[PDB]
Amino acid sequence: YVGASFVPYINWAIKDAIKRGYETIYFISRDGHFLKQIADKIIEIRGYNVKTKYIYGSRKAWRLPSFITKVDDETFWQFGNFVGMDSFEDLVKASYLSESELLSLFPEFESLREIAENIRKIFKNSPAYHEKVLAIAAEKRKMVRQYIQQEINPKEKFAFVEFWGRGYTQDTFGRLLNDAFGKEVKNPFYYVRSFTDDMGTSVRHNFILAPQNFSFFEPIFAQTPYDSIPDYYEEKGRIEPIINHRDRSVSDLISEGLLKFTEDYLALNTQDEDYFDAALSQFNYQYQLNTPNDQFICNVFSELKDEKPYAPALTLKQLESITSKQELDKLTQSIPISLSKSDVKVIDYYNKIQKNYNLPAYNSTPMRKAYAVNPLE
Amino acid sequence: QYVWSTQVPFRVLSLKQNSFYLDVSFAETTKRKDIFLKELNEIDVIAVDWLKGGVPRLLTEHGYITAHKDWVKKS
């Protein structure tokens, strides 16, 4: 499953970069670990002439420093920094400012310790806030600019290979590139898909041209053996990313499988390797995105810790404690998979309550294992 | 059993109290409930629109009516 999901894409991207004349391919933090492993294996086997490098970063480590001369209005939009708040800690963290330092400017905010829209508005209305954020950003940008200048060779014709996103992170990183190299630096990003046109120096090469949402695959990438890069630091006069490691077992097995699959996949007798990449990708993405009762999507994928599972099975009392879709999303990231994993009585109760609580309609059947059925012990 | 003509418009008499539908499907949600075709009244039919199957519907300025011979009659 994970090979079909990743390897054909990386193959397409590597071949497309060789075609477009890219000399170096950079893989960005977290999402780029497995993808760079795959690309290295492909280049080794096929003997392609292209270098690969790994770059550490993240939204948190790159958004604030990207504010060169202005704070992006996107920061105050539906997908800005004040998006996803669930508690007061979430609000204080999105604000960039401490609870005390923030409540000093917004006493009205002392309460609650629509709402998000008004919060974004009040944030947008303060020029002092804008200038303070700009100062903080110009200060945090020193280490990011030095990291870029030390890790990325600007005299080459290079590109970046990601997996999924809106494209705003790519825009901020391209702004950081321009500030670090002092010129209009074309940054092309490879995605499986993105929802935005080319903007400024950001160029976007997309693998699949279909209205599919690949956030689905975030759990797999979240098995990378270290947390999201929070920021940078300096030692030995060199800038380095803060890396707080995690256990390597899951990522070890995932990389084992991915490289086995790469070997097996490059050995296939294809009449047209590009067409097979495209066809296998189409089939595999369609299947994994529209098969919530699949044995392995149920028993393996949806059980990956994201630490709580991505879409675990549901219990009758858990559904008795819900009354909205918001409350249920806190319980699982995929209602179809969770239901396909739950007992028949749970499914029947969900059906009973869905018409009233306005929950998505469950249109699948319980998962039936297909191979290694029953306990093998 | 269906009353219709290739030559539109054409007058029809309402044998029974006939309802108006805003969709050839004659689905409940498309049946008008604000007004109806009174029994023994006449009305002009300005178009004949056919379902996917083989049943005709007679369009009036207020919506579709049935073509069944027990409910309408060409004048």
Partner: protein, 645 residues
């Protein structure tokens, strides 16, 4: 009793209520007056609280008796629905809900949160609005403003006073004694203040908490002066927890009284000495009720600034809570100057000074003559599968054709593109659509319609195609769509018959093709169609599926129509959605294959799919002609179709 008047609104309030009470008192012999509530419980509440007996409710047997032969229907709004049995010649006395200098009704446009409701209201009841609504105007300025913002007949205007501002005077009407609601008798304060703030949009903390943070200091400053501070916040403001908290903390205070909204505050205007207002229309009402001391408490004047409030509102300015306290304690607020009150009263209620009375208003109404005009209708038409169709029926047939041309031209294409052209192109279109939907912020626009150029740009940029390939494919699709056009002659001739009857007709279509390609297709179906107005989604950016194209049509045309009918094939875009906008729909069925034809087409690969489309469409045309042209019976049709196919 000669005349019969019903009065209606969503609440026991307003000019409807004022005039209703004044007539039930001073017009018991010349008019029979009833109040129609929206439901039964509303009537029960009104009757329990007021003891009147001339109260019925909508669709009540009393209402079904009165409405068919009533004389006047008094309202404070352009109602969203009117009783279907309401008499043909009734006089809709629309006594508006306030005067001011803000846009309303049709002026709110398509960006308004009430756009759908406005379109529904007007599409439904334009005949009533234009031929039966006597709108009450109070001054020439207000009459001009309202005639600009609304669709009312200048001949049916009624000039006079606002009944709710001139009926509950000292010796006038009162359904309740004010002293029974106050801690002390009204003469038991040094004065009374009425605080009427407005519901502000962006409210981190409750609108009330931001305006009046510390109620303890307010009550202290009111005791020190022996004032009665009466708080009547906006309706939505009453939902906040701070409102209820402060109402409970001072539920039995001698100076801070949270007005019980179960009573009409207008009845008490004559008892109000001071008014603390911000941006609400009620100010003018107060000015018309005799109030003369005004405090404009506008802490949020920074927002409304940078855009005249100064010249058309009275009241000393106070922007800070501390300033409001200093003003309430200082007791330095003079009565409105004679010249300024004369100015404002002229500007806003000039037609008042014409010695206008309540009975004068009732006479002007009753003595009015309805001279209605017969209005034209509007008829919009879907294009694809309504006025025109495809010689191969299914849309994807086009794509098939295009692929076959690509693969046959000699220009080399990528295998993934040729062999999989159907999926490639359809999924690229839906991809571009999702991109539009997800980039409404980045584009600062709610329009989300795509164009053919967007689809082929996506394809070219992400498949690394040459300009030759992309232009070949795009021109092939355009030329194929044009060459496969066929007319649906009966609906075209019906459209033009409608136009010849004097109705206005137009076409509203959701399609990515450019407007010129659409016009070429129409011209190949029927040249006359080129002269009909066109609302193409690709040109406008709004679609019928979202209903936005219907709103655009409503606000773009000079809507003067007695009825709107939409003819189409889509159960949603041309049915559900338009019906939600109050539009009468005539939705027919799209052409479609039957089992044998479908299986034939579905059984072919790339080499044989287009001719299979041709043959299946020929079979469909044959059975169509047999059943719905020649009028054959079941057995004859079945025999002929079998022998053929």
């Amino acid at each position: 009793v000669d005349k019969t008047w019903l009065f209606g609104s969503y609440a026991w309030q307003g000019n409807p209520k004022a005039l209703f009470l004044y007539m039930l008192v001073n017009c018991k012999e010349t008019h029979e007056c009833w109040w129609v509530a929206d439901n039964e419980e509303s009537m029960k509440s009104i009757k329990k609280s007021t003891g009147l007996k001339n109260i019925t409710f909508t669709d009540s047997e009393k209402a079904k008796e009165l409405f068919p032969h009533a004389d006047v229907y008094v309202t404070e709004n352009f109602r969203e629905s009117y009783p279907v049995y309401m008499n043909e010649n009734i006089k809709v006395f629309n006594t508006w809900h306030g005067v001011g200098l803000k846009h309303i009704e049709l002026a709110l446009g398509m960006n308004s949160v009430l756009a759908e409701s406005i379109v529904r209201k007007y599409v439904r009841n334009y005949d009533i609005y234009k031929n039966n609504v006597l709108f009450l105007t109070t001054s020439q300025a207000m009459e001009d403003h309202f005639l600009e913002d609304m669709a009312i007949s200048k001949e049916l205007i009624i000039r006079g006073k606002y009944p709710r501002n001139a009926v509950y005077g000292p010796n006038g009407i009162h359904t309740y004694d004010i002293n029974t609601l106050l801690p002390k008798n009204k003469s038991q304060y040094s004065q009374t203040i009425l605080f009427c703030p407005t519901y502000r949009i962006g409210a981190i903390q409750g609108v009330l908490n931001s305006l009046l943070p510390d109620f303890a200091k307010l009550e202290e400053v009111c005791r020190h002066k022996n004032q009665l501070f009466i708080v009547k916040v906006h309706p939505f403001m009453k939902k906040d927890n701070y409102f209820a908290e402060m109402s409970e903390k001072y539920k039995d205070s001698e100076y801070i009284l949270f007005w019980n909204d179960d009573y009409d505050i207008y009845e008490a205007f004559n008892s109000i000495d001071l008014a603390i207002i911000d941006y609400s229309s009620i100010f003018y009402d107060l000015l018309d009720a005799g109030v003369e001391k005004f405090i404009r408490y506008v802490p949020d004047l920074d927002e409304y600034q940078n855009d005249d409030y100064a010249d058309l509102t009275e009241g000393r300015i106070v922007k800070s809570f501390q300033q409001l306290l200093n003003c309430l304690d200082n007791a330095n607020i003079k009565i409105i100057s004679t010249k300024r009150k004369q100015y404002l009263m002229d500007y806003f209620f000039g037609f008042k000074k014409e010695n206008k009375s309540m009975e004068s208003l009732i006479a002007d109404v009753d003595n009015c003559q309805l001279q209605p005009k017969s209005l034209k209708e509007l008829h919009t038409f879907d294009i694809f599968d309504t006025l025109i169709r495809r010689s191969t029926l299914r849309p994807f047939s086009i794509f098939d054709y295009v692929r076959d041309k690509a693969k046959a031209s000699g220009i080399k294409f990528p295998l993934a593109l040729t062999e999989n052209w159907i999926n490639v192109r359809n999924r690229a279109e839906h991809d571009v659509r999702d991109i539009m939907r997800k980039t409404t912020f980045e584009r600062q626009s709610d329009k989300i319609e795509i164009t053919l150029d967007d689809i082929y740009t996506r394809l070219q940029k992400n498949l690394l195609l040459t300009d030759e390939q992309t232009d070949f494919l795009k021109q092939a699709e355009i030329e194929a769509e044009i060459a496969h056009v066929e007319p649906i002659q009966k609906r075209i001739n019906y459209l033009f018959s409608l136009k010849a009857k004097g109705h206005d007709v137009a076409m509203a279509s959701d399609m990515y093709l450019p407007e010129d390609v659409i016009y070429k297709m129409l011209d190949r179906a029927d040249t006359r169609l080129r002269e009909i107005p066109l609302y193409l989604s690709s040109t406008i950016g709004y679609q019928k599926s979202t209903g936005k194209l219907y709103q655009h049509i409503f606000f773009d045309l000079d809507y003067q129509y007695s009825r709107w009918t939409h003819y189409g094939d889509n159960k949603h875009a041309d049915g559900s959605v338009p019906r939600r906008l109050g539009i009468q729909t005539a939705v027919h069925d799209i052409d479609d294959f039957i089992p044998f034809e479908n299986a034939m087409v579905n059984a072919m690969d790339n080499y044989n799919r287009y001719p299979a489309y041709q043959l299946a469409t020929k079979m469909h045309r044959y059975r169509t002609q047999l059943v719905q042209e020649n009028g054959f019976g079941n057995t004859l049709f079945e025999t002929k179709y079998y022998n053929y196919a």
